[PDB]
Amino acid sequence: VDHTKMNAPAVRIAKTMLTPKGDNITVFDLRFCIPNKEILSPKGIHTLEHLFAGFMRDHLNGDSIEIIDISPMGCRTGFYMSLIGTPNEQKVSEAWLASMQDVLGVQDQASIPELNIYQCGSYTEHSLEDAHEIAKNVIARGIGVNKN
Amino acid sequence: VDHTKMNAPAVRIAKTMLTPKGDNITVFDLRFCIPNKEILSPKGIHTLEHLFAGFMRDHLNGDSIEIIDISPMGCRTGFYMSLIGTPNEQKVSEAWLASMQDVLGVQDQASIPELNIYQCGSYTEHSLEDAHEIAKNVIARGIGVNKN
Ligand SMILES: [Hg+2]
Ligand SMILES: [Hg+2]
Ligand SMILES: [Zn+2]
Ligand SMILES: [Zn+2]
Secondary structure (H helix, E strand, O other): OOOOOOOOOEEOEEEEEEOOOOOEEEEEEEEOOOEOOEOOOOOHHHHHHHHHHHHHHHHOOOOOOEEEEEEEOOOOOOEEEEEEOOOOHHHHHHHHHHHHHHHHOOOOHHHOOOOOOOOOOOOOOOOHHHHHHHHHHHHHHOOEEOOO | OOHHHOOOOEEEEEEEEEOOOOOEEEEEEEEOOOOOOOOOOHHHHHHHHHHHHHHHHOOOOOOOOEEEEEEEOOOOOEEEEEEEOOOOHHHHHOHHHHHHHHHOOOOOOOOOOOOOOOOOOOOOOOOHHHHHHHHHHHHHHOOEEEOO
16 A cells, blocks of 8 residues: 555555355554554564553453554554454554553553563663553554554 | 474475464475574575566466565574465475576576666665576475474
C-alpha cells in the first residue's frame, strides 16, 4: 500500500479472512509513526510491546473479540494486531488510546513483569522511558483512521 | 517460560486458540537466537521479514493450513507465526528450512521490488547481507525443537 498516502497515528483494517468453519480473524495495522518520516526505537517498541498487548487485552479483548497476538513491525512503524472477531477502526483506536494511558501508569522497570533473563528474550533491550514518550506522542497526536 | 532452557534455532509452540465455531488457531515461537546470548540485527530482521513471510507460505498453508501473520518479536531473538490450522513442529521446522535456503536464492537488494518509499515504511532500514547472514546460520545449525 502507498505508505506516502497514509497518515499516522491511525488504525487500519490490515486484512480480513474467515475460518474454515465460520469464525472471523481480523488483522489490524496499528501504525504509530508516519511511514519513512519517523520511526520507533528497537528498545522503545520492545518495552512497549509488553505493555500494549497486556492492556489492549483489557480495553479491547472482551467477550466477542479475541486477541491472538500483538507484535511490533519490522519497520518499527507500529504493530500488527491479529484477533479473533472483527472490530472497526473506532473500537480499536479507543482501545489503543486507552492503553497508552495505561502505559504511562508504569513509573519504572521493576513494574514490567517479564523484564528478566529468565522470562524476557533480551533483558537489556528495554526502555520504559522511550515507551512512555511514544504514549505521550500518540495520546497527544490523536489516533485517526487509514482506510485502504 | 524459562528462556534460559530454550534452544535456538528451534520451533516452539506458544499458543493454540479455540474459536467458538470450532477451528483451532496456532501461534508458533520461531526462535533464531539463544536469549541474551545472540540476537538479530534491526536492519536484518526487516529485510528477513519481507522474505520469510512469503517464502514460508510458498512451502506452507494449504488444505488445512493458513498463515495469518509472520512477524518479528521485540526481544529480537525470534519469530511468531500465527495460522488457522494445526501443523506441528516438524511441519514448521521443515518449511522454515525451505524458507531459509531461498533467502540465499535472493541475489541482491535489487530483487526486492517492495523497497520503494510507497510500499516500505522504513525501506532505508535494510540489510539483505544480514538476511543471508541469519539465513546461512540457520541452515547450518538446523532447526531444533522446544517443548514448553
Ligand atoms: Hg512515531
Ligand atoms: Hg541468531
Ligand atoms: Zn521481551
Ligand atoms: Zn518494510
